[PDB]
Amino acid sequence: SYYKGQTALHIAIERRNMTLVTLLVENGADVQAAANGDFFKKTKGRPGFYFGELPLSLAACTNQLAIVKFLLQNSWQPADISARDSVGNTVLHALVEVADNTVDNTKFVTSMYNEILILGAKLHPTLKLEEITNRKGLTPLALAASSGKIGVLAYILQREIHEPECRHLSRKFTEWAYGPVHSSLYDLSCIDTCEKNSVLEVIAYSSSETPNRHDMLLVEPLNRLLQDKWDRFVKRIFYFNFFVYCLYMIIFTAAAYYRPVEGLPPYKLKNTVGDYFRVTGEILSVSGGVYFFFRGIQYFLQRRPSLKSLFVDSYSEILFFVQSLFMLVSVVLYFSQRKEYVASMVFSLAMGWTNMLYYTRGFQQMGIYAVMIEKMILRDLCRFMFVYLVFLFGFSTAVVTLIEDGKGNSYNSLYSTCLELFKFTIGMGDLEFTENYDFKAVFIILLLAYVILTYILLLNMLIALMGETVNKIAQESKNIWKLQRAITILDTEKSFLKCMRKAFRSGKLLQVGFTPDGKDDYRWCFRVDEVNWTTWN
Amino acid sequence: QMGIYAVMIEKMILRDLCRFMFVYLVFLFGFSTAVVTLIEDGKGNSYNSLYSTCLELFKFTIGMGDLEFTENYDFKAVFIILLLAYVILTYILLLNMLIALMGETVNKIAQESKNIWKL
Amino acid sequence: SYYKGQTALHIAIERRNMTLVTLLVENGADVQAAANGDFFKKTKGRPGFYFGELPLSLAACTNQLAIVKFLLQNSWQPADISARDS
Ligand SMILES: CC(=O)Nc1nc2c(Oc3cc(-c4ccc(C(F)(F)F)cc4)ncn3)cccc2s1
Numbered sequence: 001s002y003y004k005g006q007t008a009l010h011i012a013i014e015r016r017n018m019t020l021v022t023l024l025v026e027n028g029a030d031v032q033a034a035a036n037g038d039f040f041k042k043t044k045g046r047p048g049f050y051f052g053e054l055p056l057s058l059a060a061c062t063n064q065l066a067i068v069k070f071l072l073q074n075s076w077q078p079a080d081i082s083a084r085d086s087v088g089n090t091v092l093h094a095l096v097e098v099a100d101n102t103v104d105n106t107k108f109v110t111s112m113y114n115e116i117l118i119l120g121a122k123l124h125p126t127l128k129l130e131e132i133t134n135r136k137g138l139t140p141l142a143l144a145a146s147s148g149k150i151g152v153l154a155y156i157l158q159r160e161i162h163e164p165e166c167r168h169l170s171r172k173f174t175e176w177a178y179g180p181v182h183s184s185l186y187d188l189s190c191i192d193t194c195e196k197n198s199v200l201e202v203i204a205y206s207s208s209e210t211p212n213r214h215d216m217l218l219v220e221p222l223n224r225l226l227q228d229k230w231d232r233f234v235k236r237i238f239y240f241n242f243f244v245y246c247l248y249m250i251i252f253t254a255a256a257y258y259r260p261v262e263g264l265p266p267y268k269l270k271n272t273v274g275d276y277f278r279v280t281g282e283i284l285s286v287s288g289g290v291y292f293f294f295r296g297i298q299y300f301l302q303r304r305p306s307l308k309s310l311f312v313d314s315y316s317e318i319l320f321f322v323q324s325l326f327m328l329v330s331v332v333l334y335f336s337q338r339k340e341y342v343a344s345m346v347f348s349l350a351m352g353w354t355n356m357l358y359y360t361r362g363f364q365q366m367g368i369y370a371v372m373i374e375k376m377i378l379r380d381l382c383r384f385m386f387v388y389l390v391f392l393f394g395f396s397t398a399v400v401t402l403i404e405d406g407k408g409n410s411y412n413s414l415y416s417t418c419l420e421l422f423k424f425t426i427g428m429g430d431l432e433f434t435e436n437y438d439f440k441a442v443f444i445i446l447l448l449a450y451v452i453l454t455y456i457l458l459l460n461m462l463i464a465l466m467g468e469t470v471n472k473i474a475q476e477s478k479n480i481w482k483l484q485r486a487i488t489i490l491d492t493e494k495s496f497l498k499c500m501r502k503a504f505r506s507g508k509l510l511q512v513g514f515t516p517d518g519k520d521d522y523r524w525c526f527r528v529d530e531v532n533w534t535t536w537n
Numbered sequence: 538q539m540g541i542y543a544v545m546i547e548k549m550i551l552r553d554l555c556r557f558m559f560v561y562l563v564f565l566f567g568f569s570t571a572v573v574t575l576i577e578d579g580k581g582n583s584y585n586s587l588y589s590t591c592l593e594l595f596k597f598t599i600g601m602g603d604l605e606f607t608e609n610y611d612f613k614a615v616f617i618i619l620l621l622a623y624v625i626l627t628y629i630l631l632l633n634m635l636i637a638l639m640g641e642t643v644n645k646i647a648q649e650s651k652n653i654w655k656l
Numbered sequence: 657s658y659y660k661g662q663t664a665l666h667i668a669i670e671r672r673n674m675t676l677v678t679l680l681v682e683n684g685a686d687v688q689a690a691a692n693g694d695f696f697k698k699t700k701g702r703p704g705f706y707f708g709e710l711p712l713s714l715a716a717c718t719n720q721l722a723i724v725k726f727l728l729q730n731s732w733q734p735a736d737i738s739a740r741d742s
Pocket residue numbers: 315316317319320347350351354355356357358370371373374377618619622623
């Protein structure tokens with residue numbers, strides 16, 4: 001319980017009391033404090049600390065090297081390192097759990113992590129502590145990746161260690177070096193393709209809430225690994241797909257332009273050469289439609305998107321799906337004897353053409369443009385649209401009330417006046433479009449006020465804000481594009497899951513170090529050469 | 538003073554204008570083919586040709602276009618919706634995009650333009 | 657060749673070994689190492705160093721004032737400065 005669950009040790013250690021623990025364990029102190037206190041539970045709503053059920057966890061989350069050394073090297077009761085807590089976190093899991101993203105916390109967390117690992121190595125050198133799982137199912141790496149901790153991930157993937165006595169547990173196995181040049185082999189064991197949660201699979205298919213989802217792909221091996229995959233086997237496939245889609249749109253446009261016009265919908269087939277080509281075109285178009293619909297359904301049913309990330313983490317997918325939906329509705333109408341299918345087909349064709357921009361992500365300098373237009377169709381344009389709509393509606397209803405038409409005559413309808421003011425907005429309007437009014441002064445004053453407030457004031461305001469936003473978000477757009485490219489590389493490699501997988505495996509099977517057991521360390525390493533002129537050691 | 542101007546116009550005829558031209562061309566072609574499909578001309582009459590409609594949309598772009606240039610269509614709602622969507626996406630969104638990017642590029646490359654002129 | 661053309665001096669100096677060269681040239685050390693090793697060739701694709709065929713070049717490209725002074729002011733075999741490479 002809260003204070004019936006807190007053993008002497010928890011609150012004991014809490015106040016940095018070495019002497020007290022000395023005594024308490026000299027006589028004997030239990031090291032299995034099942035503190036589930038609402039204060040000390042995982043519950044985030046409760047203001048407290050999830051240092052960990054076990055007391056070693058409490059010593060660790062706090063900057064106490066002495067106690068973390070002592071509790072484990074104390075003559076007896078060296079609390080079992082593989083101590084699954086309520087949620088399952090081992091000591092390292094808790095250490096990752098507490099870590100924040102501030103620099104000082106980076107120092108603290110990484111520094112401790114290393115030392116605890118080496119102590120565990122010495123203690124019982126058969127337990128692979130970094131693979132122990134948690135309730136949800138996640139290794140320490142998986143957690144650092146999902147929750148989002150730049151520092152911890154950086155350390156683990158660049159975890160270079162020394163003191164050969166036991167150095168198997170490292171990442172950056174250095175190789176031949178000759179002057180200012182030096183090779184280097186990374187590990188890439190649980191990064192690319194294996195387990196149930198790879199690092200490069202939880203950094204991309206992750207919600208937008210995770211902090212710096214788009215900044216963790218610059219660590220060290222991830223970046224070059226993705227680019228090596230791209231330059232080798234995910235370049236030709238993407239271009240061929242682009243070609244196929246561009247051909248499909250052309251066939252659809254050809255089928256649409258030559259639509260027969262004579263009679264109500266279901267149209268019989270002639271026996272001319274052209275009429276067969278038309279039917280073929282129609283069949284291909286509907287096939288494309290069904291394909292896209294099923295793709296959308298699968299996407300939505302497997303990677304469940306939330307209501308907020310619906311339009312923040314999936315924009316291309318939604319548009320693909322909606323285009324497919326319009327196509328299918330057109331088809332269902334066309335067979336029901338209704339000539340309203342032209343509208344659905346037209347909308348489908350327009351959106352299909354505008355959807356080519358999904359392929360700009362293969363080229364560096366246009367993906368940025370596409371992402372920028374995305375951001376400012378969700379950031380800057382909506383607000384301006386709303387305010388301008390209020391202005392237009394107000395002035396249009398005013399003028400329509402003023403107009404008389406008791407005699408360019410049917411200008412009473414609100415629609416006509418609204419259209420005239422919009423025409424004012426697009427630089428074609430007329431300042432004397434009607435004369436039926438009864439007071440010229442009021443009409444001119446309203447028109448001039450509208451022109452001042454919308455044409456000259458709001459539009460230049462929008463230009464100013466767009467300039468400011470651009471100068472703010474150039475870099476953010478770049479990063480978003482990088483993440484988008486990573487998404488597509490993963491998707492393309494997966495899509496051939498059934499076709500082939502062997503060739504789709506980066507790295508090379510190297511063997512550099514050895515294990516304390518006395519065996520080899522067969523690891524899939526990947527070279528990254530470097531040159532330095534100041535280290536010189 | 539003027540060599541810098543010439544070099545700047547070169548840089549932005551090889552950097553900024555090409556991309557905008559491509560994207561705008563995609564938009565124009567898509568909406569023009571959509572509208573041309575919608576049009577009927579089963580009765581300002583020979584508006585079936587793709588060329589005439591493309592020219593009309595470009596006229597929209599240069600601030601002279603007309604929002605009721607033809608009446609042969611069969612559904613007014615669809616025609617107006619397409620025209621308004623085009624106007625929102627090209628006239629008000631992309632052009633001010635290009636203004637913003639041109640300003641940013643100028644602020645970035647004043648010095649580069651000077652150096653290129655010296656060379 | 658790569659390691660057959662690599663003379664004792666090249667790898668010798670490489671590790672900042674004064675004493676060693678002292679001895680090696682005290683008895684005598686050739687200063688005409690024709691190291692054309694793919695690693696040590698002008699080839700940029702090969703990750704290595706083009707410090708230069710002769711070993712004085714190796715001493716020079718690396719921050720070794722001592723050896724560049726020595727190899728030329730050593731009692732004998734002051735490697736011909738005008739030593740055209742490959
Ligand atoms: C797979 C995919 O689309 N990727 C991307 N598309 C775009 C983009 O294109 C659009 C087009 C439309 C649209 C809406 C309605 C209509 C109609 F009038 F027909 F109803 C037509 C078009 N809305 C939003 N975006 C603009 C900017 C960035 C990107 S990224």
